[PDB]
Structures are given as C-alpha cells and as structure tokens.
Write a protein that binds this ligand. Structure first.
Ligand SMILES: O=P(O)(O)O[C@H]1[C@H](O)[C@@H](O)[C@H](OP(=O)(O)O)[C@@H](O)[C@H]1O
Ligand SMILES: [Ca+2]
Ligand SMILES: [Ca+2]
Length: 326
C-alpha cells in the first residue's frame, strides 16, 4: 500500500546515505568491504520494514546473505542494534576492531531520515500484507560503485559508466501471481558539486495494484536501445537498475539483455515502475520463439532467457517486428 511505499522511500534514502557515507568519509573510504556495505544496507532495509510493519521482515528477499565471514573465518550473523552501541560492537567484530570505522558506520546506520513526497502522501491505497513479497538489491552495479568515477560525460543523456549507474532497488511483488506491485529506485550519485564534493541523489517510485497505476513525477525529456557493457541508436551503460531507469525516464526505449546473468532483484522494482506506465519486462528467448517476467517462482532466481524492458508496447512490437525479420 501507499504507506508501505512511503516507508520504502524513506529506507531507500537511508540506504543511499550509507552508500554515500562509505565513499565521502575518509575513514570509510579507507577500506571484503563491498559485501560488507551491501549486506549492511540490505539488513538496514529489512529491519526497518519489519519494525514498522511486523511480519513483513520475513517477506523481504535480496541478493545478499545476512552472514559475513571476518578475517578469522568466523561466521557473523548480521543483526543491528537495538541501538548504536551493539552495532559498533558487531562492526568491531567484523572489521577487526577498527573502532572509528565501526562508529561511523553505526552513526549513519542509526541516523533518522525524514525524506517524504507530498505526491504519495495523499494517495490512500491499502494492500493486504500477506500477499506481498519483496526483492532487494542493496547496491546495483557494484563495480561502478567501487571504481568511483565522477568525471564521466554521458552520451545523449546516458552514462556509459560512473557513480550515476549505481542504484538501490526495492521491488514488491504478488506472492501468489508473481506480478510486480511496487517499485523504488534510488540513485545515490546523480549530481556532485565540484567545490564541496557532495553528491545529490534521486528517487523514483511506482505502484500498480488492481488496475490503479501511479508513479513519481518524471523530469521532462527510430528507436534508442540500451545494452550492458559485456553484451555479445544503441548505447552501452552499466547497471541493470540504471538501464531500466533509462527506459523509465525515456532516455531509451528498449533495454535488451540476452544473457542469464540478471535476477529477480535486478528487475523487480523497475518492472513494477514500468508496469505503472503501460510498459513491462518480457522474456527475451520466449518472444524470439514467439510473457512477462514473474517473481514468485524460480528455476535459480535468475531471469533465464534474458529480458526486454520497455515503456511503450508500441515500441516493443515495432522493435520485435524489425528485429526478427533480421
Ligand atoms: O552492468 P551490466 O553489464 O548491466 O551487468 C549487470 C550489473 O549491472 C549488475 O546489475 C550486476 O549485479 P551487481 O552489480 O549487483 O553484482 C548484474 O549481475 C550484471 O549482469
Ligand atoms: Ca548488488
Ligand atoms: Ca545487481
């Protein structure tokens, strides 16, 4: 429902805050750290949603485990809190007792966020909690996150690489039918002030429930196609979330992926937002033999057969016609 969606936006901003903190504070920029940040962000999302909506916390699935393996080989189960002290203790257990890295992490983990949207505040939609499943990618395009390029110049509005390709993806789907219902995409690194080195982000939301379709306000902007960097008119770009975003905003009309290296958490949130706009994601191999992606049944959680992401079915039929006449 709209309430759950507002909470998801809030925790998306907290996740973006953790992601930015790990690269803009010197002690965190010091420092496997990428999976540490990913597992931490996923756990922050999960625990916030469980605390605000009891019973939801078990329904939140993601790319990361909640277990980590420190330098000694100890398995540590990630449970934060109940407040900052035990979080600093747990982080000192994972980070070999580096006290100020632990303290900075717990400081931005437990820091309250009051990020809202007046558009979604008046929307009053209720959805029974028992039917909701959640796929979460805490940090999409991890290689661009660690690479940290800030100076990349886009091509026709599309960044081929850089921190702009990093996203936090939170998708909600129907447990029984497998249809995506709700979507949040957080872009933590959209704009950087050259003189303060501070990054401004963006967030996009969508909802598609029983014939009702709402979405966040989009900025104003033959076919334009986005492909990934290792895919084997047409632009290359990093990030599954980011390419779906290019389709959402209209920077591109089709996003094709022919490999089987995406998963439900890569595509769920974006699929829901696209669905709220008349678009969707279809199974690529299924269309070529002549079928929307579902999120309740696995194979394991990979989107086997690749995908096409589209905002307008007009463009999809045009493209498939021209495509398989060769
Ligand atoms: O950048 P591409 O070429 O679109 O490749 C995508 C990449 O962006 C991420 O979505 C990646 O997940 P992750 O970054 O979370 O490991 C996914 O597995 C790759 O297939
Ligand atoms: Ca990821
Ligand atoms: Ca991913």
């Amino acid at each position: 429902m709209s309430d759950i969606l507002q909470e998801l936006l809030r925790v998306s901003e907290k996740a973006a805050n953790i992601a930015r903190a790990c690269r803009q504070q010197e002690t965190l920029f010091q420092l496997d750290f990428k999976t540490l940040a990913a597992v931490l962000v996923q756990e922050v999302i999960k625990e916030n949603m469980e605390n605000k909506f009891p019973g939801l916390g078990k329904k939140i699935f993601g790319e990361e485990s909640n277990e980590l393996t420190n330098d000694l080989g100890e398995k540590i189960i990630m449970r934060l809190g109940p407040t900052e002290e035990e979080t600093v203790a747990l982080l000192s257990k994972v980070l070999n007792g580096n006290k100020l890295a632990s303290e900075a992490l717990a400081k931005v983990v437990h820091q309250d966020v009051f990020f809202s949207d007046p558009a979604l505040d008046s929307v009053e939609i209720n959805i029974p909690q028992d039917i909701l499943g959640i796929w979460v990618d805490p940090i999409d395009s991890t290689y661009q996150y660690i690479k940290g390029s800030a100076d990349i110049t886009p091509n026709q509005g599309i960044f081929p690489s850089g921190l702009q390709c990093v996203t936090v993806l939170i998708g909600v789907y129907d447990i029984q039918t497998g249809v995506p219902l709700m979507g949040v995409i957080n872009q933590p690194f959209v704009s950087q002030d050259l003189h303060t080195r501070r990054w401004k982000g963006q967030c996009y939301w969508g909802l598609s429930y029983l014939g009702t379709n709402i979405h966040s306000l989009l900025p104003p902007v033959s076919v334009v196609i986005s492909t990934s960097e290792k895919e084997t008119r047409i632009f290359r770009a990093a990030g599954a979330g980011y390419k779906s975003l290019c389709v959402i905003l209209g920077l591109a009309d089709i996003y094709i992926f022919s490999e089987d290296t995406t998963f439900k958490w890569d595509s769920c949130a974006a699929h829901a937002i696209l669905r709220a706009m008349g678009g969707g994601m279809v199974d690529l191999k299924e269309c070529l033999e002549r079928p929307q992606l579902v999120y309740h049944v696995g194979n394991q959680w990979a989107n086997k057969g690749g995908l096409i992401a589209y905002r307008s079915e007009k463009q999809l039929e045009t493209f498939l016609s021209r495509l398989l006449q060769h």
